Design a binder for this molecule. Structure first.
Ligand SMILES: CC(C)=CCC/C(C)=C/CC[C@H](C)CCOP(=O)(O)OP(=O)(O)O
Ligand SMILES: CC(C)=CCC/C(C)=C/CC[C@H](C)CCOP(=O)(O)OP(=O)(O)O
Ligand SMILES: CC(C)=CCC/C(C)=C/CC[C@H](C)CCOP(=O)(O)OP(=O)(O)O
Ligand SMILES: [Mg+2]
Ligand SMILES: [Mg+2]
Ligand SMILES: [Mg+2]
Ligand SMILES: [Mg+2]
Ligand SMILES: [Mg+2]
Ligand SMILES: [Mg+2]
Ligand SMILES: [Mg+2]
Ligand SMILES: [Mg+2]
Ligand code: NA
Ligand code: NA
Ligand code: NA
Lengths: 314, 326, 283, 318
């Protein structure tokens, strides 16, 4: 029997007071968008309680911010499942129409579910964000879209990516940065250029991004075995490239998690010496995101049901 | 050069009211930067290094950055030499450039170097040179400026996968897809990102990201990409059917003669210049000194680039002798 | 008394009466007011109605902080040039965040508490923005005393310039972005268009207060004295200046609308709420 | 001008003002100084002129701004000339009432009178700063000038009632009575760069700026003490303030100013080490600007006929 290692995290575990209402509202939005073809797919999303992830990762934001962020999470889950998760060339050639919409240079066709929804989200983000904040978000979305071609490339040649390549690319394949980009926007504040881009702030963002990607890899491993051999998963990557048992691969992912937490706490102590209020709120945002994501992933029907009944949990 | 049309082509004029200037350090820095490129071992062939020497890449750096001090010009000239060498050897090359999956899978080691997360291998000429340039930019730029440059480089690298995607299935991109992607496949934004750095100043978040500044930057980027497409068309017929070229795209998708394709590129250039002058008038009403300096930077870049493209051995020699110039 | 037309929205913070009571209790606890009659006058004045009408969008905690600051200003206004100038360095020391205040000055103790509470919800740049406006307001008081000391009515040009800083309006404009939980960047705040709108709004509030409250430091008196006008003609010229400033505000706002970021738009709506809310409170 | 022997009847020892900051001078010092002195002559602000010439104001500009290009040094040199002339040339009530016309010129709401030498010059300098600075940078400078002008009323208030100000009041007010902040406001402008709001206003950067401002004011007070004895009993001078309020001999007051100097240097180095952990390149250039200002000011003041000449012949120099 497999033992899932614990994912210790000293960060506060909180949830937005608007979780229940906004989750239902954002799910209804997703259903109305026609981004998902199957009624069964719509129901699987509903059961996953995507709005619980939104509320746990953004526990401080006002209701209208949570709703906007929840709609964005729903777009990403839908897009990730429907577009991304065969042939790198076909998928690369599909991107420019979407990039046109993202740059606001073209009206989507009436039949383009993903384009119509992305246009609406860009407009709604633009209503509550500065041009710098909008571009910050847009840049992260573009990197995410192009990162999906890299996943398609690995599937096309039927290779498990190497640890070095995977850990680098996992930071942008997961879209976590596109959600970090809405922390200040969601809270109604705005980090200045040298606040946002400060090496300490970037380092904490990168470690938070690693933690969320790796934590999802550990907990989503079981359901990913059912889809292209869990190719894009640190458990599969370490098992394959270090010739580990599944149990030892799970433990190595837990080790990398613990080491990233240690690295986060160290850099945070340095940042604490100089950080302004806006930077402190953003870093607390990263902490809520990492901890809220673990709470969500351990409890979501998206991940839990795929684990065999005899799997042990900490 | 062998003629590729039934009757001589007339290269249309590329009118531009922007000042045409050259950095006073052009001659000395061109030679210094070329020596740096040769010393880097990024280019394997002596013949390749010689064709780069003949192209006078430092003339492009000096014309596009005419105001910057010598140390700035040298750094920017080294960056242009990196881009020319990399674009020719990697992006448009036989091994990586003809399959989306191969090019995509080759990027992560380079991205690692770009993020300052890894020492290049002693034999990785492109990686060692990129690490050196990252460090030299970091010496004279704020973290926001370095990240801005790094972001434009990542956008450029990812964009190359799309070019490879087109080569792989042997298709000419449609006009709408090509004009969108041509703004990021050409690395022009990575050079715009060094205008404030080069001049010793720094646009703040809302200056850089202001819709008016982004619009002028996008129009400048269009002009440079299309102007390069017009003048590099002849040399590009010799590699991959000039697939990534507005002339090929319009000729193919609108069923135009090459002469009519060239004229439609010139019309698009004239439209972009008119759009630039219109948006510049709006920006003039609010622009701070740093924003005005950056926009003058865009104007110098567009005009200096036309002068380079009309005069560089990289482009001129591939045109048949019966080609009429503007 | 001529009308003061104003196309800016008239709104009130829903927390007006709850926070007015809380803030008045805070003022009574501060001992900044000596007389029981003065404390009762302040209670009945509903200073929190001015705070709520001039800051109608801010959350309750922001309204409470701003209401306490208005109470500090009104108390400080209620309580010669040389004496005034020499009284400032101890307030400045508290303001600088350089030393804890003595039990000795009620104004110092409360100013320190407000600085701490502003620092808790503002960036260092925002705190320094507010500090600068408070210093200018304090130094501006000396100028008023200078005129009183030699029994002079100030000239129109001197009065209109100094009236912008004698009234402390800029100290309240400095808490608009803070109160709303956002922050204008240096080049947003200091853009000539944003400074011009800030200055026109400050002009309007000062001139509106002068006219509605109508003595030596009053635009009606200044114009009547220096332009040899009847009281009625002085009142009308003040109303004309008001209408000209409103017109100037709308035209400059139209120019700003071309380029303004969302934070700048929110701030400018803040100026509009302040001008209109001030008139609503005064009437 | 001065005495052979001490006004105390014992030779006075001027304590050293130790400082590990590099002493540098702008390569354009001599040329720009002459040009700036010409400018001042042409302004008609001086009606004094010969002592300024001998004082070599341009040497202070060049020592305090050693890295800036020639055009920046010239602008800064003209501004120093404006300040030295104004401090010399300029009752609390009369002084307070003289400020608004100057404030109007500063805020562009008024043209100066054809006869207003100081207003005409201030207008020209504002426009020349505006030519090479962002609106935020111009407002930074404008704000420090206003604070400087208002601070002169506090000096007039003490003079009017004949009070020596207390150490706590004087030390606070000395940071704005001296106009030092108006010169710090041109460090980034002079260098062709610009600190962001949260760079400029960071507590570490404000602390270093305030300590640098303290150092320059106290160092000037120590070295200008003899000259200021001949002007309103050296009322506005830390030596007078400490001697009066802490019941010190003048010799012990000089030594206490040097102790405060050494304490401020130590505090600067400690805070600079903390700032080193986060500082961006523009912040590092500005902080190096503060160091050059403090050190260049000591070099200038110790060698200046403006200060050295007033001390008795038996004074013991460091
Ligand atoms: C893009 C997306 C799916 C969701 C958006 C919300 C989000 C950033 C969640 C954090 C978890 C992880 C990085 C999601 C993407 O990985 P992966 O594709 O392995 O997600 P899965 O394990 O749920 O399938
Ligand atoms: C990236 C590079 C090659 C040069 C760096 C300098 C630069 C941004 C030049 C502007 C011209 C054009 C956008 C070059 C890339 O396209 P293309 O591959 O069509 O250039 P080519 O026509 O010279 O081959
Ligand atoms: C304002 C002025 C005089 C010059 C501008 C240059 C400047 C800021 C010099 C630093 C030294 C000191 C603060 C001068 C003002 O004090 P004080 O009036 O005691 O100077 P003094 O000792 O030269 O008379
Ligand atoms: Mg997925
Ligand atoms: Mg995925
Ligand atoms: Mg997963
Ligand atoms: Mg290319
Ligand atoms: Mg090429
Ligand atoms: Mg080309
Ligand atoms: Mg003085
Ligand atoms: Mg002195
Ligand atoms: Na700010
Ligand atoms: Na000011
Ligand atoms: Na700025």
């Amino acid at each position: 029997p497999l033992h899932i290692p614990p994912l210790p995290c000293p960060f506060p575990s909180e949830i937005n007071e608007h979780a229940d209402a906004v989750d239902e509202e954002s799910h209804t939005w997703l259903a109305a968008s026609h981004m998902l073809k199957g009624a069964d797919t719509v129901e699987h999303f509903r059961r996953s309680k995507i709005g619980t992830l939104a509320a746990r990762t953004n526990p401080t934001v006002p209701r209208d911010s949570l709703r906007l962020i929840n709609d964005w999470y729903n777009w990403l889950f839908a897009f990730d499942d429907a577009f991304c998760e065969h042939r790198a060339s076909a998928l690369a050639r599909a991107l420019p129409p979407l990039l046109e919409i993202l740059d606001g240079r073209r009206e989507p066709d009436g039949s383009d579910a993903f384009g119509l929804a992305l246009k609406e989200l860009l407009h709604r983000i633009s209503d509550v964000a500065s041009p710098a904040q909008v571009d910050r978000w847009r840049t992260t979305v573009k990197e995410y879209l192009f990162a999906q071609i890299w996943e398609a490339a690995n599937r096309e040649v039927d290779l498990i990516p190497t640890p070095d390549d995977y850990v680098l690319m996992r930071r942008i394949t997961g879209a976590t940065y596109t959600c970090f980009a809405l922390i200040d926007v969601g809270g109604g504040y705005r980090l200045e250029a040298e606040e946002w881009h400060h090496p300490d702030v970037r380092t904490l963002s990168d470690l938070a991004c690693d933690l969320i990607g790796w934590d999802n890899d550990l907990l989503s491993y079981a359901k990913e075995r059912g889809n292209d051999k869990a190719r894009h998963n640190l458990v599969t990557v370490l098992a394959t490239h270090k010739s580990l048992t599944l149990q030892d691969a799970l433990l190595e992912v837990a080790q990398m998690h613990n080491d990233a937490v240690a690295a986060f706490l160290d850099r945070r102590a340095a940042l604490d010496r100089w950080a302004t209020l806006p930077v402190r709120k953003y870093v607390r945002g990263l902490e809520h995101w990492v901890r809220g994501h673990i709470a969500f992933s351990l409890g979501s029907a998206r991940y839990v049901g795929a684990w065999p009944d005899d799997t042990r949990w900490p």
